[PDB]
Amino acid sequence: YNPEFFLYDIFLKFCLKYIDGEICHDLFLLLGKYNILPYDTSNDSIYACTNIKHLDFINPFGVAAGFDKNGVCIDSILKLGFSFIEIGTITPRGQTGNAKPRIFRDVESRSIINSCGFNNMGCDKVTENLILFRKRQEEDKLLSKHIVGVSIGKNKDTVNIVDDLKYCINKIGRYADYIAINVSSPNTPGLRDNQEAGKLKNIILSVKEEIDNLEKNNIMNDEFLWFNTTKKKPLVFVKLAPDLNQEQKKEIADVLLETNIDGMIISNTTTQINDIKSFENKKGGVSGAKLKDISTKFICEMYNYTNKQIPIIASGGIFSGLDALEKIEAGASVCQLYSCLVFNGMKSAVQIKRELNHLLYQRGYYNLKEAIGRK
Numbered sequence: 001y002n003p004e005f006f007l008y009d010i011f012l013k014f015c016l017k018y019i020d021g022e023i024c025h026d027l028f029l030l031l032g033k034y035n036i037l038p039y040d041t042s043n044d045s046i047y048a049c050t051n052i053k054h055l056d057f058i059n060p061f062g063v064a065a066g067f068d069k070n071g072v073c074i075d076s077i078l079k080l081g082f083s084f085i086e087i088g089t090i091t092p093r094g095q096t097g098n099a100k101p102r103i104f105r106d107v108e109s110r111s112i113i114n115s116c117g118f119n120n121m122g123c124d125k126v127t128e129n130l131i132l133f134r135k136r137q138e139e140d141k142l143l144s145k146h147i148v149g150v151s152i153g154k155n156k157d158t159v160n161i162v163d164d165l166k167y168c169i170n171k172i173g174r175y176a177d178y179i180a181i182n183v184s185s186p187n188t189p190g191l192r193d194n195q196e197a198g199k200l201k202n203i204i205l206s207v208k209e210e211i212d213n214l215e216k217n218n219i220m221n222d223e224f225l226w227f228n229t230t231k232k233k234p235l236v237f238v239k240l241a242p243d244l245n246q247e248q249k250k251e252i253a254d255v256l257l258e259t260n261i262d263g264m265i266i267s268n269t270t271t272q273i274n275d276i277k278s279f280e281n282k283k284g285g286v287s288g289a290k291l292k293d294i295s296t297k298f299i300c301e302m303y304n305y306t307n308k309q310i311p312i313i314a315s316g317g318i319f320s321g322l323d324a325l326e327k328i329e330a331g332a333s334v335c336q337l338y339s340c341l342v343f344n345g346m347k348s349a350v351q352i353k354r355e356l357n358h359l360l361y362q363r364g365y366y367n368l369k370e371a372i373g374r375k
């Protein structure tokens, strides 16, 4: 491995015991901004590359939304060894989010709870940050072929979700490889109710429509319209919460096929977790190890209910290569990490890529794509 990763695990050990969780996170981000994290400069195995339609991932691990909300250190997080990152969730206008403290960690169970409430700098600032990233990407050998998706959402006092989505799309869409529609945060009331079938359908179609209209105004070639990685219009995903009834699920499955959505992220955080003692005090959505089983089962169902037609992005509870293969066997094409980063540290992507590779060999798969959906 590397010593650089070593010191940071030590600093991280310290910070987990004594420092407030949001502060640790900001600290991590500040280190990224300053470009003093370690680099994974290794070639990823050609046997674990993956794709979602025409969107190609050099490796199957990315970082989930809510980690770099404002795109302040995309380079540095990608350079840890991840194939992609999802920035945001963003909203049209900058927002403080809910009252601090709003993030707590339980180390022993490797779980997190949060009630952030979409704290972010807003679309215009985040768009400016993405633009600067995209300019660096053109000059930096390590960033080529790396994917950046943008998670989009609504301001908390916004009545019309769709108007919020549309505005985001027209601002930042050109710079995104994909757009994740966040209708699943349990920290802005209601929002989660937008997963009801009628509103969701309308939402997907308006998203898809605004993206298409990006292409129509401009005089330039596509090479110049899409200032992203794929050089094409961003794909459209929707991230779902796991706190839904079986009937609801089958009904959401239906609308995804009907609207021909490019993919689904399963899943967002849960509020259905009761047995974490340090979290009785606390409010919001739950991440980490305890979410793994629920999230896995949710992938199975949706893959089934969509007839293996809608590419799945998996989240969360993913810590090991084994955790990772479970998701893939259940039907995920690609995996996002969040908590693992928090508890396992900067080495997370290097560690997990090796384990997925070593485990793909013991199960005698020829490559990753062959494992998808092999229950």
Ligand SMILES: Cc1cc2nc3c(=O)[nH]c(=O)nc-3n(C[C@H](O)[C@H](O)[C@H](O)COP(=O)(O)O)c2cc1C
Pocket (backbone or CB within 6 Å): 064, 065, 066, 067, 069, 088, 089, 103, 112, 113, 114, 116, 118, 151, 182, 185, 239, 267, 268, 269, 286, 287, 288, 289, 291, 315, 316, 317, 318, 336, 337, 338, 339, 340
């Ligand atoms: C502090 C925090 C902030 C988050 N912010 C977002 C967000 O803005 N948008 C989103 O779609 N998910 C958000 N999430 C959910 C994560 O993206 C991820 O789906 C969830 O943590 C499950 O993954 P995990 O078990 O690997 O941690 C957030 C999670 C945490 C813990």
Ligand SMILES: Cc1nc2cc(OC(F)(F)F)ccc2n1-c1ccc(C(=O)NC2CC2)s1
Pocket (backbone or CB within 6 Å): 008, 011, 012, 015, 021, 022, 024, 025, 027, 028, 031, 103, 105, 112, 341, 342, 345, 346
């Ligand atoms: C991976 C990692 N390594 C870190 C080393 C650190 O110490 C140093 F600043 F380097 F001295 C501080 C934070 C670190 N992170 C963290 C990143 C995000 C973290 C976190 O808790 N998110 C809260 C939402 C749970 S924790």
Ligand SMILES: CCCCCCCCCCCC[N+](C)(C)[O-]
Pocket (backbone or CB within 6 Å): 004, 007, 035, 036, 037, 038, 039
């Ligand atoms: C500014 C050098 C001090 C670094 C010591 C603690 C972290 C070391 C990681 C440095 C790696 C930075 N770099 C060159 C990989 O980007």
Ligand SMILES: O=C(O)c1cc(=O)[nH]c(=O)[nH]1
Pocket (backbone or CB within 6 Å): 066, 089, 114, 115, 116, 117, 118, 119, 182, 184, 185, 186, 187, 188, 268, 269, 285, 286
């Ligand atoms: O911003 C948040 O509070 C948030 C958003 C989201 O999608 N998921 C989550 O757990 N928290």
